[PDB]
Amino acid sequence: HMLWARLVGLARLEARALSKKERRSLLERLKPYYTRIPFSEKADLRLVKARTDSGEYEIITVDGVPCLFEWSDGRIYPTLQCLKAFGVDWLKGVVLVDKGAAIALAKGAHLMIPGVVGVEGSFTRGDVVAALYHETRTPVMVGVAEVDSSALEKLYREKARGRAVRRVHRLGDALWELAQEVGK
Missing domain, CATH: 3.10.450.120 (Pre-PUA domain; domain 1)
Incomplete structure (x- = not known):
């Protein structure tokens, strides 16, 4: 073809x-x-x-x-x-992100903790996860978790600085x- x-x-x-x-x-x-x-x-x-x-x-x-x-x-x-x-649902976890972060990921940026607004599932550093725009649940990027899901739960609520997910593939x-x- x-x-x-x-x-x-x-x-x-x-x-x-x-x-x-x-x-x-x-x-x-x-x-x-x-x-x-x-x-x-x-x-x-x-x-x-x-x-x-x-x-x-x-x-x-x-x-x-x-x-x-x-x-x-x-x-x-x-x-x-x-x-x-x-x-x-077949992924170990997904991370929900705000609008500015969904847009940044769709431009190719990695996902930093301050753009995270929610965590679903259970995963550890190194696991494959997807980042989804929270409002519409649209997947925008697939990558590797840089922190465990239980640590991310705390870090996003504090809006700590740092990388949450390393980009592998994105919209x-x-x-x-x-x-x-x-x-x-």
Whole structure:
């Protein structure tokens, strides 16, 4: 296939079904980091590789939805499209943020504690979490918790300074634009 996305531009695509061993491995790689696997063991899993001007992206689709990708720490993370199709309850936790923080994250900033207004779930430093604009519960960024959820509960109420979540993927980034078009 070929597609043309905002930001990244023209992309040449190569897709293939995941092997039975690859599907098994994927489930095993996810189990330690999320509350549960969000999709069925019957869902159609494919690996889509897209080559654009600057480089290459690899995304796992679940029933056609561009949902998972491997990051530089070797862990598998969900795209924001995955959170839309499957929700956020399967993540260990989510952090609710104010409007200025939702906007900053949609521009690519990391999430600092003063923009946090709520914590859900239970997680420790290093866990995968999603940041959501509190008013509409719109996911705006996926990243890594820099503090435990019980510590964050105290820190956001004091509006302490410091990083709460390290950005990995966010609304409007290159992967987001590519994923939006794959989904189309």
